Design a protein around this ligand. Structure first.
Ligand SMILES: CCCCCCCCCCCCCCCCCC(=O)OC[C@H](COP(=O)(O)OCCN)OC(=O)CCCCCCCCCCCCCCCCC
Ligand code: SF4
Ligand code: SF4
Ligand code: SF4
Ligand code: SF4
Ligand code: SF4
Ligand code: FES
Lengths: 226, 588, 198, 180
């Protein structure tokens, strides 16, 4: 398949969506709800690009790159001004209720939400009203729970139920009061519950064992091991 | 279109002249944020291109800079020729008020370039440094030895595979190098230093060392003397090498600012200004007017500080030991204001990407007014007591004189260039940081640059800086001290302390670093001692891929042998006093 | 508590010999001639302390000898560059007893911000240091404070009165750390002036 | 030299001597350290301290932003937690033999815990004693910023500050609540 991103030609797989095709090409599109192993659901609305009908089209429309096939002869723009404004607005809407928590948050320096907030260029707060707040749950000895930091991207429930076939994690409530966790306090029963700390793009689900002796990612000495 | 926008400068007449002379396929034009036309030239055509540029109707007369780049780890080289290494040549046409950068691509195995020394004599030390730090050989160089590192040094430190950090100390190698110092005079041969015809059996070779510390630093000069007369001398430098450019590859864009402060340690915010301007070009930041006025005021205060030290130390070197006490009292008044504003004396590290660290504290205008009332009577007293003394005049007038052609061929800038009658100050020719909104004059000489004319030109520069400071005091704009850009590093502190998106931006900017998109930027300023420039290459990361600092003191110290030949040693020490250099500037 | 250079020993100190030792220590600590040696920006702050606005001459320490033989104090005021380290060692070896060393600034203390290929990480890697000054640069009165600290250290050391009679070992007092001495007053600080003013 | 040059030179020598004598008749510009204390402006970058909130608790949440913002790398600390969940440094050490007093750590601190204070007198006899641990840094009050409290802004619950009790925070609404 042939796509044209910002006037540049690219050869991609037509069976892929535009988000994974553009990320495979090295282009940067902000995203939350999509994961490579979980598929596309189009929830967070972060991955907006401007799609044009043809080469001689200047109006276009905003589409979700994760929900749009990377079909042959597809004309899109990432750096379009309206697309950039909408992506910044999505980050801003996520920022309205987000707690002032980065210094005391185990995700800091390793946080996809921090990276996408910086990537969209959103650094000025004009929202002045109250932030919604949630109580936390005890999830056992491995996973720490902090629902204030949730951006309702649904990655956790999609991984835990649709991928890992777990039964004791879910989404509750409605509108801006959606809650992600167990129906009651208790240990997460899945043998693969620990992947939530990397699946969750925020600091809702964090490594409790690491949190005991916490340090930031830049301070780590890493090695590839088995 | 903003001033930081990426341009190819194809509308420059030099591009059309090169296309008409060499053909369209002879060179590749690179689009940069350097503000100059960047032209990739084949290695076999470099001397032809340089000669053509030197023989233009309004010619390129000065080799501003010459250095190298290790391009092996550079991932964003779109539109660039294939290159493991590269060598760049920054040339300036003062008559055109234009400049051009020429880039020569080199493969890893074939690391040799023809020498530029026949076209420009300052290419000698520039090519010696490029050989020392990169391992790039220059064919036809008269003596291509290491200039920063000692001669028994292994490796080339600016290469990407050379480790930046300090190696483990060993007393054995210190003992060995002490032995080399002890038998250096016993086994001295003029041939390895570029000297010749010595020991005729009438000349002597005499080494100068760290015995006259007039705040310039430690370096050596070996003099070939016919009795009392200098027939040849080479400076031995690199005793103040700090690896500052390598540190530029080692620190984030924000955390490198204190290192910029210590390049020319009498300059402070003057040193900070070209770096933050070049970073702001990389970030696409246009600072507001209050930032421009604050940065100009800090730069002029530090220029007066540096000029006071320079004039007083020149007077002390001539022999009059009194005015240094009073001039350092004036430096303390400047330090009162600078301490109040920035919190520090000599290395404020106060400029920021997108602005300055804090707003001006309440009551700064009182201290500025006190200094502006204190200074002129003291300056007139120094003039009458020392600079109009005929013994000082007889020690300085006509000593180490050079004209416009010698200044142009050696890259001399600042007061040494303007004493030859060439009106070239960056604050007027290529205005920056809102300097075009200030009323000030550029003092120029009569055509001949002695020690005395350089010192008096710096006195007039001090008076003009006082005028600029008066304008800064009278018209300080109301507004922000930081730009409203997302890459302003750090963000305003109060919003960081109460707004989550601002806190996120601050968190990532101070820890991982601000992400500068892949580009090349350049900023040239009129520093205290001449023209200082930063050339920054970003590979899209939070650290500089390459930080090249052009300093004027390097060029002036290279000009030393041409200007002092045929003079006495007393003329040499007076000349060193009148150059206005520090060894940190020379060695970086 | 004392350290002996010929180990941790006690105080070796007749009452006339104690008075002579005190007189020699008083004369040495009140007449300290620094060596005029400039490495980097810290030396600019040192010679600033020599000028009229600070007047280090008041302590009798302004003479500033150009020869290491006439100097009692080496101030390493600046970075110990690798090329300059043999020069520093040779100049220190050329100094005569008694000699004291003040490491001035972060570079001379530890290498400072220059953990880099061409810089020795602190002058105490190869020459002994009597007083360390943190700062980059230390302000001139910090150099004067270190001079006074050196004076206190000199005023209670034990050195031979003559090289022909008596113990020839050099005893240096194990002084209390300035951090531990000032901890009581420093921790008790509650409020400081806000940085929005002059 | 000519006779006119000699006479003019003698006149300039006389003028220099006269001006320096009149300087001897002038007022001393010496700041008399240590008897006269050095005036330091409020934002002077000297000895680093760690400060306390207005409630008396230490402000440092061990977020490690100062240590990574340090270009010298002379700050080392480790996070620890109380039973109520308050983050704090288990240890906090600063190598002042390395520190360049640049103020980047204070600039990077999101709680205003770490502060450079107007105190320059920091000379030491042994270099090991220039390593300041937490007991040598933590002071009894707020320092230069008298009122800021990070934990009044953070969404994380601690002792005395439950969920919904921070600034601009609504009370938590249970998903089981009857209101639509
Ligand atoms: C007994 C105890 C007391 C002893 C006293 C000893 C001193 C001699 C008597 C008093 C002399 C007073 C001199 C007054 C000088 C006034 C200062 C002055 O303005 O000098 C500068 C002036 C030239 O001004 P301008 O050209 O602008 O200089 C700046 C550029 N360089 O310069 C001039 O205009 C020069 C004016 C003439 C100066 C000489 C006057 C006659 C001297 C006769 C004796 C010879 C002295 C020298 C002999 C040397 C031989 C080795
Ligand atoms: S989840 Fe990310 S953005 Fe939110 S508080 Fe934690 S580090 Fe900050
Ligand atoms: S808890 Fe994490 S993974 Fe789940 S919806 Fe919220 S932000 Fe997404
Ligand atoms: S400690 Fe700082 S001021 Fe002193 S020599 Fe080093 S860089 Fe210069
Ligand atoms: S003042 Fe600078 S060098 Fe010192 S601890 Fe803070 S960041 Fe590090
Ligand atoms: S930046 Fe401030 S709160 Fe964070 S670890 Fe350092 S002193 Fe503590
Ligand atoms: S990643 Fe496409 S809408 Fe969420």
């Amino acid at each position: 398949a042939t796509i044209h991103v910002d006037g540049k030609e690219y050869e991609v797989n037509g069976a892929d969506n535009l988000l994974e095709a553009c990320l495979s090409l090295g282009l940067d599109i902000p995203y939350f709800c999509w994961h490579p192993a979980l598929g596309s659901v189009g929830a967070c609305r972060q991955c907006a690009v401007k799609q044009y009908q043809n080469a001689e089209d200047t109006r276009g429309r905003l589409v979700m790159s994760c929900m749009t096939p990377a079909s042959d002869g597809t004309f899109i723009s990432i750096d379009d001004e309206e697309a950039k404004q909408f992506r910044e607005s999505v980050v801003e809407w996520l920022m309205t209720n987000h707690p002032h928590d980065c210094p005391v948050c185990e995700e800091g320096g390793n946080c996809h939400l921090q990276d996408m907030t910086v990537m969209t260029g959103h650094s000025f707060r004009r929202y002045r009203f109250t932030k919604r707040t949630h109580r936390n749950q005890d999830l056992g000895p491995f996973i720490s729970h902090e629902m204030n930091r949730c951006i309702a991207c649904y990655r956790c429930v999609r991984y835990y139920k649709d991928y890992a076939d777990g039964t004791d994690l879910g989404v509750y409530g409605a509108h801006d009061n959606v809650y992600f966790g167990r129906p009651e306090d208790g240990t997460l029963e899945s043998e693969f519950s620990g992947n939530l700390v990397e699946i969750c793009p925020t600091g809702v689900f964090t490594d409790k064992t690491h949190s005991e002796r916490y340090n930031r990612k830049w301070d780590m000495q890493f090695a590839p091991s088995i | 279109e903003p001033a930081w926008q990426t341009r190819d400068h194809l509308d420059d007449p030099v591009i059309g002249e090169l296309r008409n002379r060499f053909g369209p396929d002879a060179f590749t034009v690179q689009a940069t944020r350097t503000g100059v036309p960047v032209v990739w030239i084949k290695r076999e055509q470099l001397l032809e291109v340089g000669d053509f540029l030197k023989k233009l109707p309004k010619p390129y007369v000065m080799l501003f800079d010459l250095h190298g780049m290790d391009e092996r780890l550079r991932t964003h080289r779109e539109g660039l020729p294939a290159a493991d290494f590269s060598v760049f040549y920054h040339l300036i046409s003062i008559d055109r008020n234009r400049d051009i950068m020429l880039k020569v691509a080199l493969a890893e195995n074939d690391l040799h370039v023809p020498t530029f020394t026949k076209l420009f004599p300052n290419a000698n030390w520039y090519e010696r440094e490029t050989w020392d730090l990169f391992g790039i050989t220059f064919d036809g160089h008269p003596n291509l030895r290491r200039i920063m590192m000692p001669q028994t040094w292994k490796g080339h430190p600016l290469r990407k595979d050379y480790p930046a950090r300090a190696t483990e100390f060993s007393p054995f190698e210190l003992t060995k190098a002490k032995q080399d110092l002890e038998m250096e005079a016993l086994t001295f041969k003029p041939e390895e230093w570029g000297m010749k015809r010595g020991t005729n059996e009438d000349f002597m070779f005499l080494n100068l060392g760290p015995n006259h510390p007039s705040a310039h630093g430690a370096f050596r000069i070996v003099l070939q003397l016919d009795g009392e007369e200098i027939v040849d001398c080479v400076p031995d430098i690199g005793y103040h090498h700090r690896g500052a450019e390598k540190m530029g590859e080692r620190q984030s864009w924000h955390s490198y600012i204190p290192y910029t402060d210590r390049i020319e340690y009498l300059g402070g915010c003057v040193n900070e200004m070209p770096y933050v301007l070049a970073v702001e070009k990389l970030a696409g930041i246009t600072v507001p007017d209050r930032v421009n006025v604050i940065r100009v005021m800090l730069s002029e205060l530090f220029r007066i500080n540096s000029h006071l030290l320079y004039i007083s130390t020149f007077i002390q070197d001539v022999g009059a030991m009194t005015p240094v006490f009073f001039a350092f009292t004036d430096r303390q008044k400047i330090y009162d204001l600078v301490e109040a504003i920035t919190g520090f004396r000599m290395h404020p590290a106060w400029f920021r990407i997108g602005g300055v660290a804090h707003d001006l504290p309440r009551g700064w205008d009182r201290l500025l007014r006190e200094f502006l009332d204190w200074m002129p009577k003291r300056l007139a007293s120094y003039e009458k007591a020392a600079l109009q003394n005929t013994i000082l005049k007889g020690r300085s007038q006509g000593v180490a004189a050079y004209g416009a052609k010698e200044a142009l061929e050696w890259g001399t800038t600042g007061a040494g260039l303007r004493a030859t009658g060439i009106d070239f100050d960056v604050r007027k020719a290529r205005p920056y940081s809102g300097y075009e909104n200030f009323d000030f004059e550029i003092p120029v000489g009569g055509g001949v640059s002695d020690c005395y004319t350089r010192v008096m030109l710096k006195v007039e520069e001090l008076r003009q800086s006082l005028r600029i400071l008066e304008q800064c005091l009278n018209n300080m704009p109301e507004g922000p001290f930081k730009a409203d850009h997302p890459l302003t590093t750090p963000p305003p502190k109060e919003r960081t302390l109460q707004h989550i998106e601002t806190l996120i931006t601050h968190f990532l900017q101070v820890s991982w670093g601000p992400v500068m998109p892949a580009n090349e930027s350049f900023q040239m300023i009129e520093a205290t001692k001449g023209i200082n420039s930063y050339y920054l290459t970003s590979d899209g990361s939070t650290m500089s891929y390459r930080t090249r600092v052009r300093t004027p003191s390097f060029a002036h110290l290279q000009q030393i042998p041409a200007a002092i030949r045929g003079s006495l040693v007393s003329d040499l020490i007076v000349y060193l006093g009148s150059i206005d250099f520090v060894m940190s500037d020379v060695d970086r | 508590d004392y350290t002996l250079t010929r180990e941790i020993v006690t105080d070796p100190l007749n009452v006339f010999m104690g008075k002579l030792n005190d007189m020699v220590n008083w004369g040495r600590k009140n007449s300290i001639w620094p060596y005029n040696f400039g490495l980097s920006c810290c030396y600019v702050e040192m010679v600033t302390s020599f000028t009229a606005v600070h007047d280090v001459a008041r302590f009798g320490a302004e003479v500033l000898r150009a020869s290491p033989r006439q100097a009692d104090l080496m101030v390493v005021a600046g970075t110990c560059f690798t090329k300059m380290a043999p020069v520093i060692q040779r100049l220190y070896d050329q100094m005569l007893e008694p000699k004291w060393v003040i490491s001035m600034g972060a570079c001379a203390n530890s290498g400072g911000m220059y953990d880099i290929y061409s810089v020795v990480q602190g002058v105490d890697k190869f020459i002994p240091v009597d007083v360390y000054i943190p700062g980059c640069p230390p302000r001139p009165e910090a150099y004067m404070q270190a001079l006074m600290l050196l004076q206190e250290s000199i005023g209670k050391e034990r050195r031979p009165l003559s090289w022909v009679v008596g113990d020839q070992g050099v005893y240096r007092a194990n002084m209390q750390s300035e951090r531990e001495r000032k901890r009581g007053e420093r921790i008790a600080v509650t409020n400081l002036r806000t940085p929005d003013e002059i | 030299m000519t006779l006119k040059e000699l006479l003019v030179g003698f006149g300039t020598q006389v003028r220099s001597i006269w001006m320096i004598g009149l300087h001897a008749f002038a007022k001393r510009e010496t700041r008399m350290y240590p008897e006269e204390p050095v005036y330091l402006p409020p934002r002077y970058r000297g000895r680093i301290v760690l400060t306390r909130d207005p409630d008396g608790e230490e402000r440092c949440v061990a977020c490690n932003l100062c240590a990574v913002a340090c270009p010298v790398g002379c700050i080392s600390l480790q996070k620890a937690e109380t039973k109520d969940g308050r983050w704090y440094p288990e240890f906090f050490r600063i190598n002042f033999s390395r520190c360049i007093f640049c103020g980047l750590c204070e600039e990077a601190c999101p709680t205003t815990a770490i502060q450079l204070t107007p105190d320059f007198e920091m000379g030491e006899y042994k270099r090991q004693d220039l390593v300041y641990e937490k007991e040598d840094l933590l002071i009894s009050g707020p320092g230069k910023y008298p009122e800021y409290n990070f934990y009044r802004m953070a969404g994380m619950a601690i002792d005395g500050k439950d969920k919904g009790e921070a600034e601009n925070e609504a009370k938590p609404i249970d998903v089981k609540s009857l209101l639509p």
